[PDB]
Amino acid sequence: SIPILKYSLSTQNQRVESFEVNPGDEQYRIYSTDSLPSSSEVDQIIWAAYRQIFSEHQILKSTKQPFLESQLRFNQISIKDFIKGLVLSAPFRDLNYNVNNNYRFVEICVQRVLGRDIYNEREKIAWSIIIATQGLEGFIDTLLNTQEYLSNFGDSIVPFQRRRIIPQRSKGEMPFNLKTPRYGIEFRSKLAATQFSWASPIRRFRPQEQQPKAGDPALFLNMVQEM
Amino acid sequence: MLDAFAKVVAQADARGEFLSNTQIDALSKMVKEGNQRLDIVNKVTSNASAIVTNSARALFAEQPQLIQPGGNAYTSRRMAACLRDMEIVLRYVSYAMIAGDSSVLDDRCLNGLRETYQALGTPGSSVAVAIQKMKDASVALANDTTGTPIGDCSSLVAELAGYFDRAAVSVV
Amino acid sequence: MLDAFAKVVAQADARGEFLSNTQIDALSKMVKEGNQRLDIVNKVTSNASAIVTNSARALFAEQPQLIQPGGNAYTSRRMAACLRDMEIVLRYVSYAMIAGDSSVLDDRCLNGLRETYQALGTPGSSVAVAIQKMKDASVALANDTTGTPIGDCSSLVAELAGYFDRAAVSVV
Amino acid sequence: MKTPITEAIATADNQGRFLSNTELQAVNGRYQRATASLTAAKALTGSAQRLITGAAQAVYNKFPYTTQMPGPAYASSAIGKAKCARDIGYYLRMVTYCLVVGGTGPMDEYLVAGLEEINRSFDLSPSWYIEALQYIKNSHGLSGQVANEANAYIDYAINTLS
Amino acid sequence: YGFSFSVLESQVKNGQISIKEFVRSLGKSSVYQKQFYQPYVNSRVVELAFRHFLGRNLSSLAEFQKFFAILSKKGLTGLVDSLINSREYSDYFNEETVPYIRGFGEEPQECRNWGTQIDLFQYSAPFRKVPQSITLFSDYLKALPDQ
Amino acid sequence: MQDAITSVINAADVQGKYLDANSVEKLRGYFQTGELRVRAAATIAANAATIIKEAVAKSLLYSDITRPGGNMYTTRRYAACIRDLDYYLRYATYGMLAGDPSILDERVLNGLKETYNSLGVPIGATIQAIQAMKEVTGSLVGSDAGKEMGLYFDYICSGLS
Amino acid sequence: AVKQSAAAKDTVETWRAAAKEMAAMRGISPMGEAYFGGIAQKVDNGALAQLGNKASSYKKY
Amino acid sequence: SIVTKSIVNADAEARYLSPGELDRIKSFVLSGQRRLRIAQTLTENRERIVKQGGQQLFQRRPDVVSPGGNAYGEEMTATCLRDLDYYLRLVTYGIIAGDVTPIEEIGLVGVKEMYSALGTPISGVAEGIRCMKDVACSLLSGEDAAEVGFYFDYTLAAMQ
Amino acid sequence: SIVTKSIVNADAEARYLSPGELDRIKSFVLSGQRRLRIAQTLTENRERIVKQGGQQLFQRRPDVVSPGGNAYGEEMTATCLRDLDYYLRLVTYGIIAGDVTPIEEIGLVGVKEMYSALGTPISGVAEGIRCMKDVACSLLSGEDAAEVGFYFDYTLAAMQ
Ligand SMILES: *CC[C@H]1/C(=C/c2[nH]c(/C=C3N=C(/C=C4\NC(=O)C(CC)=C4C)C(C)=C\3CCC(=O)O)c(CCC(=O)O)c2C)NC(=O)[C@@H]1C
Ligand SMILES: *CC[C@H]1/C(=C/c2[nH]c(/C=C3N=C(/C=C4\NC(=O)C(CC)=C4C)C(C)=C\3CCC(=O)O)c(CCC(=O)O)c2C)NC(=O)[C@@H]1C
Ligand SMILES: *CC[C@H]1/C(=C/c2[nH]c(/C=C3N=C(/C=C4\NC(=O)C(CC)=C4C)C(C)=C\3CCC(=O)O)c(CCC(=O)O)c2C)NC(=O)[C@@H]1C
Ligand SMILES: *[C@H](C)[C@H]1/C(=C/c2[nH]c(/C=C3N=C(/C=C4\NC(=O)C(CC)=C4C)C(C)=C\3CCC(=O)O)c(CCC(=O)O)c2C)NC(=O)[C@@H]1C
Ligand SMILES: C=CC1=C(C)[C@@H](Cc2[nH]c(/C=C3N=C(/C=C4\NC(=O)[C@H](C)[C@H]4CC)C(C)=C\3CCC(=O)O)c(CCC(=O)O)c2C)NC1=O
Ligand SMILES: C=CC1=C(C)[C@@H](Cc2[nH]c(/C=C3N=C(/C=C4\NC(=O)[C@H](C)[C@H]4CC)C(C)=C\3CCC(=O)O)c(CCC(=O)O)c2C)NC1=O
Ligand SMILES: CCC1=C(C)/C(=C/C2=NC(=C\c3[nH]c(/C=C4\NC(=O)[C@H](C)[C@H]4CC)c(C)c3CCC(=O)O)/C(CCC(=O)O)=C2C)NC1=O
Ligand SMILES: CCC1=C(C)/C(=C/C2=NC(=C\c3[nH]c(/C=C4\NC(=O)[C@H](C)[C@H]4CC)c(C)c3CCC(=O)O)/C(CCC(=O)O)=C2C)NC1=O
Numbered sequence A: 001s002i003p004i005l006k007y008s009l010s011t012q013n014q015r016v017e018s019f020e021v022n023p024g025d026e027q028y029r030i031y032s033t034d035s036l037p038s039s040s041e042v043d044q045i046i047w048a049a050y051r052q053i054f055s056e057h058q059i060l061k062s063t064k065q066p067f068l069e070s071q072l073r074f075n076q077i078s079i080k081d082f083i084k085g086l087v088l089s090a091p092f093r094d095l096n097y098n099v100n101n102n103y104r105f106v107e108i109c110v111q112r113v114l115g116r117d118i119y120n121e122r123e124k125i126a127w128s129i130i131i132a133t134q135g136l137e138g139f140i141d142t143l144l145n146t147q148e149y150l151s152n153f154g155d156s157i158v159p160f161q162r163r164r165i166i167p168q169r170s171k172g173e174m175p176f177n178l179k180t181p182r183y184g185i186e187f188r189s190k191l192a193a194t195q196f197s198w199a200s201p202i203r204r205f206r207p208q209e210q211q212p213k214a215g216d217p218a219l220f221l222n223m224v225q226e227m
Numbered sequence B, C: 001m002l003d004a005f006a007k008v009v010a011q012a013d014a015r016g017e018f019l020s021n022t023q024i025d026a027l028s029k030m031v032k033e034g035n036q037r038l039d040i041v042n043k044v045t046s047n048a049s050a051i052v053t054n055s056a057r058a059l060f061a062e063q064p065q066l067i068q069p070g071g072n073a074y075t076s077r078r079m080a081a082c083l084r085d086m087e088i089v090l091r092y093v094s095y096a097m098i099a100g101d102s103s104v105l106d107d108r109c110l111n112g113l114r115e116t117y118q119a120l121g122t123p124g125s126s127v128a129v130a131i132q133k134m135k136d137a138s139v140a141l142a143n144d145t146t147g148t149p150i151g152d153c154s155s156l157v158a159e160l161a162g163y164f165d166r167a168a169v170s171v172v
Numbered sequence D: 001m002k003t004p005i006t007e008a009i010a011t012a013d014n015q016g017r018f019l020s021n022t023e024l025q026a027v028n029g030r031y032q033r034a035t036a037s038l039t040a041a042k043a044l045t046g047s048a049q050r051l052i053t054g055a056a057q058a059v060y061n062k063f064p065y066t067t068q069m070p071g072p073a074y075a076s077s078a079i080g081k082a083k084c085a086r087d088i089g090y091y092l093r094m095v096t097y098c099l100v101v102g103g104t105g106p107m108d109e110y111l112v113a114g115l116e117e118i119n120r121s122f123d124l125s126p127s128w129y130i131e132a133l134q135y136i137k138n139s140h141g142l143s144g145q146v147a148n149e150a151n152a153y154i155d156y157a158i159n160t161l162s
Numbered sequence E: 001y002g003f004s005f006s007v008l009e010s011q012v013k014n015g016q017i018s019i020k021e022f023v024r025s026l027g028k029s030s031v032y033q034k035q036f037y038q039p040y041v042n043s044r045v046v047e048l049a050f051r052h053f054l055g056r057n058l059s060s061l062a063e064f065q066k067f068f069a070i071l072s073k074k075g076l077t078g079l080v081d082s083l084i085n086s087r088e089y090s091d092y093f094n095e096e097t098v099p100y101i102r103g104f105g106e107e108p109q110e111c112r113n114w115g116t117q118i119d120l121f122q123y124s125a126p127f128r129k130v131p132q133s134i135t136l137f138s139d140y141l142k143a144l145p146d147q
Numbered sequence F: 001m002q003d004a005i006t007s008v009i010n011a012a013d014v015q016g017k018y019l020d021a022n023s024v025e026k027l028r029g030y031f032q033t034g035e036l037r038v039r040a041a042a043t044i045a046a047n048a049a050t051i052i053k054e055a056v057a058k059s060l061l062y063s064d065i066t067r068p069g070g071n072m073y074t075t076r077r078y079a080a081c082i083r084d085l086d087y088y089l090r091y092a093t094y095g096m097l098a099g100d101p102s103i104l105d106e107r108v109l110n111g112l113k114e115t116y117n118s119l120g121v122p123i124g125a126t127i128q129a130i131q132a133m134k135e136v137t138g139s140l141v142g143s144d145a146g147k148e149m150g151l152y153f154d155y156i157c158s159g160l161s
Numbered sequence G: 001a002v003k004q005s006a007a008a009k010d011t012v013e014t015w016r017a018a019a020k021e022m023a024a025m026r027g028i029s030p031m032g033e034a035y036f037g038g039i040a041q042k043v044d045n046g047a048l049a050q051l052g053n054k055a056s057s058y059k060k061y
Numbered sequence H, I: 001s002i003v004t005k006s007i008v009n010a011d012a013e014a015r016y017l018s019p020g021e022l023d024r025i026k027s028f029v030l031s032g033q034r035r036l037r038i039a040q041t042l043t044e045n046r047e048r049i050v051k052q053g054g055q056q057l058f059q060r061r062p063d064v065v066s067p068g069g070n071a072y073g074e075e076m077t078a079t080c081l082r083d084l085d086y087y088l089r090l091v092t093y094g095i096i097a098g099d100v101t102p103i104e105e106i107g108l109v110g111v112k113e114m115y116s117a118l119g120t121p122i123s124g125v126a127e128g129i130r131c132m133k134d135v136a137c138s139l140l141s142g143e144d145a146a147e148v149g150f151y152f153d154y155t156l157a158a159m160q
């Protein structure tokens, strides 16, 4: 009954291994409910779930889920049922689902939930019909039953961005909250009449004759300060 | 998602004032046509699967190269996908007819839809005529007067027409 | 992520020689200043929520159109997001002060912050105004001679001032 | 925003179903109570400058320290009293936005979400705004079900702050 | 450039003054002398006057010295009034017809200023800052130059 | 100043012979494209200011000829440009209708590169403005009509070089 | 000319039935709104300037 | 019209009218039956062409109608649509005259001086005429929409 | 300057300079000490004269900065203030030259062709210079504010 469009993979960091036994400093901190946390250390998991599935913004008083928080602390539901309550939360609909289309919302729910980037643009095409046929509640449980969710998160780990940085290096890739914001350039530009009409304030006035031209040694002073 | 009432409010809060006095009278104009707004949608969802299969057969009375071997809508996965996309487009224009403006139509369905089909290889204008085979199967179905009494309601079916050709130019 | 000592180790790791005995004297001068470093950080992390709200209040009097109806930081959903956005910059500036080098400032904070203000439509020149509001509050609190011995700390507040105007030129 | 229309649309693409007659009645009951709603939003907009300056004075009579304490959070300046009067302008404008669309959608989007984080960062006491809203709730002069609709969105603004 | 002579378009559109009056006042204007008088020499100003207020090049050498001495003594206001008040203006244009450029296929031309007049009826005319006609009419009499 | 018909008549007249099959063969070729050229000259007349506004913003709007010291700094100098670019888009329209570029060198090209060197106008930026102006002109009139209007733009750019 | 007075001599009269109901959207009760993307741009809210008229509009008689 | 300036062209040149001028006066008068039909369509569609014309104008330029805009209030908005009724009328003249000569000396010559002297944004009124053009060309076939739209965009060009 | 056009005036008239012309070149050069002080005030106040200049410009013309305005976004608003820095610079030239001759052939001749061809509302940039004038004259005494403001309003006049 209409299987998914057979897309193709690509080259990424999460589908190879690291050879990192005893990983040093850039570990992304496995908060889990098999380490048996105290009641002040359940609270450091619930903040990490809110920071992963929302951004750091929407951890407001109105966007908290105080009945879903209590059922985690009674060990009634798991972490996998707690992430599913956060995408089906009514703050996640009106802030992150009404302001972008179905092909950008798949880029949110694979970067935050699976912790990997999208493979190519056909995977956003291949996944966006699941939201329009059986709904968002039918979209999350077919995304939380994938083998990429179970083989490194399972039923007890709040997800994270897997292999963001290369171990000898210090730059790496971009964090996913700074990769895909709440809305993009294509939703912002079409609404410039009703919403998003701001016009911009004045910049600091730089005079025009102080700007560097080709063959000026002031275009290399940022190179010299990195020496 | 905004209905017809929220589009007035979101333009006035961006400016920052309250609603005018003619300001609701035009919204109070909308609610005395409220039964006439609703029972149009009581036609177009209650005969909704008839509108799909009549238009999808009559598209290949016009362009039978889609069902040709090598064509786009040839195979049984792809014939099940062509009836899928015409069921979704008919679903969102029924949502806009109960709203009053097209804001749920071009935020869910039509936004970024041309660039899907060009990356898929689906012919762009050849699905737009499938939408126009559903409009005349529905705006003639809206003018039918089974069960309801008689009054002039040509203004509302122009908006029901007005969603089907707003959606038609967004896939070409 | 590096500290100040890690950038001297990993530099000559690429050259592949042992660390020279005249480079140890530069690392031992750093640990003589290691306890004047720790109360620049303790001065700014303790008045942290009043560096933020006194700098936002000074911003919104100079540029009043950011908070007026139809402005960017207008509503109570978005005043809180603007107030968060200076807390994150003050967090990573104090992180790069306690490490001695800016390798965690431009990695988890500034890595594409400019390109998401073009997508959000936020005025990036005004975020660089409100960072220099916070620079002027934080170097005045690092000159506070209460509960601390008197000495010359001018070379370390000039390094804290360097991480403030690095994060200001990375959003414009 | 959550109107009764946009939540009837929202349960349809929850399941991904068509709009049945379990949502046409939700829009039908909205059209019944919109004739006692837009007669309330008209009267609150017409007497808006009487209600706003009367509600600023009800705060200052109950809390006289706010008119004379020095500091930025209090209305003892010229610009402190202007920022107080536009705040009660904002609380009345979201009531008449909520009466028009028939639900708590605009004040969820614009007032309520994020309110605690700005009343704590700017030292604004939430008992000031309950006194500004309690003056409106029994001195708008409305009478009947037109009064019963204004006393459900003023009371929704109170229970956020309370 | 958004220039404007509203007073002159006034007094010509009503017929209060002729086109010849409107042309002469344009010549004594300051937007003219900033354009075709200041950047040039009195030698070159005389030839550029003929292209404008007469639609033709200088004809002889004595026609130069008569009109150079006038410009030599009265400047722009004395030269343009001495062209607009000539008979040759009136025979071609009296009070109503804007001056045209008397091209090759207009009029029986003369063999003596053939090359120069074709040069003068080009947009490249205002950049020969060296006088083209006073030297050419004078080398017709003197021997071959050193070059 | 000859069109395609004038050039065909001249060459057939300059040998003193009548209009044979080869001379009329090109004339029939010109009359076939007569319908295309008018519609090409139609839309160009309508969008004259829009085309020049698109070319300068796409080629030389923000380059440092636009800034102080550049060749286009002062408002008189900037205003001379769009006045100057108007002739290139206008005379190219005449060549597109006449089907012969004789009008360009007769009224535009002669003394042009010798004039810009006098003023010090950069010929390099001028041609790229006309190239960008040629690019937008192919947008309006279509492909083949853009091929026709474009055939006279580079004729200006070639001789102006 | 007296038979054509006051109706057909007023060219702005024919659109007063529509430009009077096109302009009845988003009324502002206190002083201050029509913020328009975050600038001041306020109001006059009198009887005259709610109809947009000026000092040159009653002095025209 | 094409008749009057084809005359004054050949008038100035001291000559009669060429075949190029007289085969177009001829070609224009046989076109006259089709021109009156086109102008007849816009004549009694001014209620929709103007009112929907100001429809898109305010949705695209809310500043001019917002408080502080030039066309603010019940008063100016009526005059805000009055000018569109003017320019829609002149386009009916240009269609029947076969040229923008009626539109030239009425509503175009010195138009920037008027609107600059009235405080009206001249770019805003240009946006209004463009909104009327889409409504006008939507009322006619493709062969006609290449004309009725053709006179609007000339008015757009001269109005900026 | 007053020196160069008092010359080219008497140059065209085939004469030398009268006492009326030479008692003012004389009167201007003794005025030169006071002119450099006035231009010196505006020279290192461009940070406050431009930024507060664009302050009132956006509060008075939010259309130009709103979405759809010509100076919309981070980009155009920077150039939106760049032109004000230009015109503030030319006023410093006119004060030292004792005339709008520097402002004439820079930023005034053919200015309407540029801004019309850039899509910028020329009336909007005129509003910007007026906002700079109130900031500039607020920085100087009454004897100076009759000059520094005097050159702005000439730029206002030619810019419309
Ligand atoms: C003799 C080999 C040359 C060389 C190799 C080299 N490669 C890397 C790093 C990566 N290679 C990949 C490629 C894939 N990973 C996969 O999982 C798959 C299957 C889909 C492919 C095709 C990736 C993702 C990396 C980066 C991550 C990783 O470390 O595995 C490196 C490491 C660079 C480093 O400094 O860490 C090396 C050294 N380089 C040479 O110099 C040789 C010429
Ligand atoms: C006074 C501040 C100016 C302003 C700020 C503003 N910012 C946002 C939104 C975001 N900012 C970021 C940037 C980061 N988020 C991070 O988590 C990190 C560290 C990893 C960085 C560097 C992101 C992702 C957003 C989107 C949501 C969020 O996470 O905060 C907003 C809200 C946008 C909205 O419309 O809801 C505002 C208002 N805006 C101004 O007006 C001031 C000039
Ligand atoms: C009469 C009320 C009392 C009072 C008010 C007062 N408020 C402020 C400052 C702010 N109030 C808000 C609140 C909102 N902004 C919104 O957009 C909305 C939703 C529509 C709400 C509820 C915000 C964000 C501020 C700070 C920014 C600002 O507007 O200036 C102030 C100024 C305090 C300061 O530190 O700036 C005052 C004085 N104070 C009183 O004394 C009255 C009792
Ligand atoms: C049928 C009459 C026409 C046609 C249809 C066709 N469509 C697809 C594939 C897709 N259609 C979409 C469209 C949407 N997805 C959504 O979620 C929404 C609402 C927001 C829309 C409008 C998408 C994402 C796909 C790709 C995924 C899928 O397989 O469904 C196909 C199949 C392409 C394939 O290779 O599988 C077909 C055949 N094509 C025609 O020829 C007709 C004109
Ligand atoms: C569940 C959804 C639902 C509905 C559709 C309406 C159904 C409905 N419609 C009408 C009443 C009406 N319904 C219509 C509508 C129409 N008449 C026609 O001839 C057209 C075919 C069609 C519009 C396109 C009109 C015109 C009236 C008013 C009768 C009249 O004009 O006298 C009434 C009588 C009371 C009333 O006006 O509301 C009812 C119950 N109510 C509902 O609860
Ligand atoms: C974990 C908590 C922690 C701290 C807060 C610091 C606190 C601290 N600072 C100093 C020691 C010092 N602290 C300062 C600091 C200052 N003098 C000034 O005038 C400035 C205002 C200010 C910092 C900007 C100086 C200058 C010295 C050294 C005294 C000297 O060499 O003159 C010492 C004594 C060390 C010693 O005796 O060797 C301690 C405990 N260290 C810590 O481990
Ligand atoms: C310097 C002294 C001086 C003056 C005053 C002057 C006036 C003058 N006013 C004119 C026209 C005009 N003047 C007006 C004026 C008006 N219409 C009204 O209703 C008002 C009462 C009045 C404005 C106050 C109009 C409308 C025309 C155009 C007439 C036409 O086209 O027939 C004309 C015809 C030519 C032209 O404008 O180009 C001249 C010459 N000429 C001068 O040299
Ligand atoms: C019909 C054939 C024809 C052409 C083409 C022509 C050009 C011509 N271009 C000129 C100037 C100019 N042309 C430019 C043009 C430019 N600056 C740039 O940076 C660009 C590269 C370029 C625009 C594309 C400028 C700035 C001037 C003014 C020069 C000055 O004031 O010194 C001038 C000097 C006089 C004047 O403009 O009034 C002439 C005569 N004349 C003709 O008869």
Ligand SMILES: CCC1=C(C)/C(=C/C2=NC(=C\c3[nH]c(/C=C4\NC(=O)[C@H](C)[C@H]4CC)c(C)c3CCC(=O)O)/C(CCC(=O)O)=C2C)NC1=O
Pocket (backbone or CB within 6 Å): H064, H065, H069, H070, H071, H072, H076, H077, H079, H080, H081, H083, H084, H086, H087, H106, H107, H108, H118, H120, H121, H124, H125, H128
């Ligand atoms: C046939 C050619 C022609 C035109 C075009 C014309 C225009 C014209 N527009 C006017 C006013 C006006 N025009 C506007 C127009 C607008 N406000 C906006 O926001 C929009 C951008 C724009 C309309 C689309 C406004 C607001 C006034 C009144 C201005 C005032 O009262 O100060 C007036 C003064 C009042 C009057 O007598 O009508 C004239 C004469 N006259 C003509 O003969």
Ligand SMILES: CCC1=C(C)/C(=C/C2=NC(=C\c3[nH]c(/C=C4\NC(=O)[C@H](C)[C@H]4CC)c(C)c3CCC(=O)O)/C(CCC(=O)O)=C2C)NC1=O
Pocket (backbone or CB within 6 Å): F057, F061, F062, F063, F066, F067, F073, F074, F075, F078, I064, I065, I069, I070, I071, I072, I076, I077, I079, I080, I081, I083, I084, I086, I087, I106, I107, I108, I118, I120, I121, I124, I125, I128
């Ligand atoms: C010294 C005399 C002088 C002036 C004045 C001048 C102006 C000038 N303004 C420009 C752009 C611009 N100017 C504006 C201006 C504005 N937007 C608004 O809303 C306001 C009304 C207005 C400013 C107050 C904008 C938005 C652009 C960019 C337009 C675009 O990108 O299409 C450009 C093109 C980019 C550049 O090279 O800077 C020039 C040359 N050049 C000169 O030599």
